[PDB]
Amino acid sequence: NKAAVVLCMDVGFTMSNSIPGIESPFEQAKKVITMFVQRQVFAENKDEIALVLFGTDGTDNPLSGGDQYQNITVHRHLMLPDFDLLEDIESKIQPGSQQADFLDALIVSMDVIQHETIGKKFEKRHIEIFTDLSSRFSKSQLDIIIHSLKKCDISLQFFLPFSLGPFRLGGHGPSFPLKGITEQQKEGLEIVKMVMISLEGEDGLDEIYSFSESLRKLCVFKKIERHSIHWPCRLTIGSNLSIRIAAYKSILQERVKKTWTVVDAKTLKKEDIQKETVYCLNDDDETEVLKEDIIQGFRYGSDIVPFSKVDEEQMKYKSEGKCFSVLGFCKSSQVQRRFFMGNQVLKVFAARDDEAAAVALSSLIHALDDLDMVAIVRYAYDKRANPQVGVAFPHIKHNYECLVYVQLPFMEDLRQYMFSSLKNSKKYAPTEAQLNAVDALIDSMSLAKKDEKTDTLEDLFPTTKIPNPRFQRLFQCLLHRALHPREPLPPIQQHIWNMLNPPAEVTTKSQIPLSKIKTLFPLIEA
Amino acid sequence: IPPYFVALVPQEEELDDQKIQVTPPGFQLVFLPFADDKRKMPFTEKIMATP
């Protein structure tokens, strides 16, 4: 499953206008595109990327017939990204001295998508445009653009310097204050809104991001990310009732797919280094014993009991693999989140294409939701997988419904520890002033706000939408080392810290209560 | 080690009729997944069930 992405970028004079105290839009767009290319390259994704720049002095586009579609250059064709693209983005791409509209650039991007994707099969086609919307443009080709986009199945995404005192990139705050926007910018925003509505309906509004917002949203990869595989099984409620189901891994910790290979310092080759493991007895002679002369064993309280691998396999617990059986139903209040185990969460839907299984699963989910119940079930990936006991609870949304499954603990997996009570201690009991100070601190540091007469909490620091900074740090360090072999690693990028920190308003409001708490609470290190 | 966003949920002491502690008082540390820790589910038409 491959994809084609055409990145359209403005390099005009307006993009270079760096307002004091705010980074220029050109730099923010460069950072966003660099992040996208880093993710695409270092992830070893088989995705094709092309780059079109509109606003350059020259013209290097196929549509350069006469005096139309000028100041547009196809910097890179539709071929796999490499370090060359990153190097060009970083150093040898400078702002142009001419201003060009984004409509002819978008037409050029569609033409590139159509022509290049003639000898290759691509499941998805995406076009991303980074522009300021501060250039004159003509609407004569809007209808044909929309028709071509709809016919060719091409997705669209817009990135602008402004979203729909101090300013920080990815700082969970206002990037571009709404004081100074030019009229042409308003017209361009309205046109972009019209195009997005005409393409994806009302859902298209959410696809108009901002550089600062996009730097901490992972939105650029939304339309190219691959779906997880499905695990098919049969949910069993008895011995004669079965519902075909498919389970996906809704949540799973993401690790680094690429490992580190040990190489020799003098020569950077892994074939000159060999790693071997040896076994020796408990004798001064260090007698060597072959692997075939080794037997598995276990400790039995100061006594060693030999236990060969074949014997263990013969006598190990055996069960019928690939089972999803409902042990029973219990009140949801009897299952507590603190007891959740495992490292994954499963989302169970009906089978691929069948109305009967969907109806049965919907009936079960609705019954559980109405009765306030969850299903204690037995889960086993396959014959080898160790069977586990888990809880499946309904999850109903306006657009879809499913069963969320999370593993549950065993009796020996629970640790019984005793902790001294704090509410009945005469030495650690806080005073009224201390409680008031803590209450003031909590009030002054609320990450959720109440909306205007609608009773809908709004999250000010949605950490769930923040990408993992480790991957970005690793990618930036790898790129710096590749392009600068003879320099040390650079410091952590500022926007990473900005996105990893809360809004400055919270700290500003919390300054006073924190000082009050410090004065009231005496803390001294031992 | 990379940092992780977590939530400290208050946990009040609870005792049964036997007067033996079963839920110690303190904070519950819950790990909040990052954006990349999630996965995208395939689109599936929603079919309702009759009463």
Partner: peptide, 23 residues
């Protein structure tokens, strides 16, 4: 202390695992 395992002092005696017992 009530409900204390005789085998291992300091740890409450865990009840035997019953399983699923329908009401």
């Amino acid at each position: 202390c009530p409900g204390e395992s005789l085998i291992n002092p300091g740890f409450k005696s865990k009840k035997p695992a019953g399983g699923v017992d329908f009401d």
